[PDB]
Design an enzyme around this catalytic site. Sequence first.
Site, short mmCIF file in Angstrom:
data_model
loop_
_atom_site.label_atom_id
_atom_site.label_comp_id
_atom_site.label_asym_id
_atom_site.label_seq_id
_atom_site.Cartn_x
_atom_site.Cartn_y
_atom_site.Cartn_z
CD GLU A 11 -2.99 -0.91 0.21
OE1 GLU A 11 -3.08 0.13 -0.43
OE2 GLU A 11 -3.93 -1.83 0.20
CG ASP A 20 -7.91 3.75 -4.37
OD1 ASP A 20 -8.52 4.12 -5.36
OD2 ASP A 20 -8.47 3.02 -3.47
K LIG Z 1 -2.09 2.59 -1.97
#
Ligand SMILES: [K+]
Length: 164
Positions: A11, A20
């Site tokens: 992440e 994202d």
């Molecule tokens: K991310």
Amino acid sequence: MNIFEMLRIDEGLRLKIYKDTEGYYTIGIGHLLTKSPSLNAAKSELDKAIGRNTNGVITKDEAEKLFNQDVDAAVRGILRNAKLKPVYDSLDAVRRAALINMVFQMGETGVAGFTNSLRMLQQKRWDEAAVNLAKSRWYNQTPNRAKRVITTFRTGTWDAYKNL
Ligand SMILES: [K+]
Ligand SMILES: [Cl-]
Ligand SMILES: [Cl-]
């Protein structure tokens, strides 16, 4: 390697609100704020999440705080789901981390719907599960990450995250 390290790799860490892979506002270590197209809306969720008026930027400590909560929530979600739990309970530790990873990324409900893969995993049919897992929108949209996670379920080792 452990779940936190694993997810930190997958992440990243960004201290300002960003979009994202799906285009949704997020911050920190993969902390989704909202699926809303409104940045203001995202800011509002951020302030609420952190407990202060931030205007879009947080500190590393703050990021880690949401991450801890998010990892815990993924686990709790698995334990609370009638489809997930039995699978998680049947797995060794490394594989358990792979499942936590998927739930963090897609949510409890999402992973719970991978019926067939779930079954293969419970059966300990590693190679087959892996092939099955790859037949998904998830794999298609985030193939490198998906491959890492699948390798983890395949092998029960951290080889995909080793040397990263
Ligand atoms: K991310
Ligand atoms: Cl939150
Ligand atoms: Cl990817």
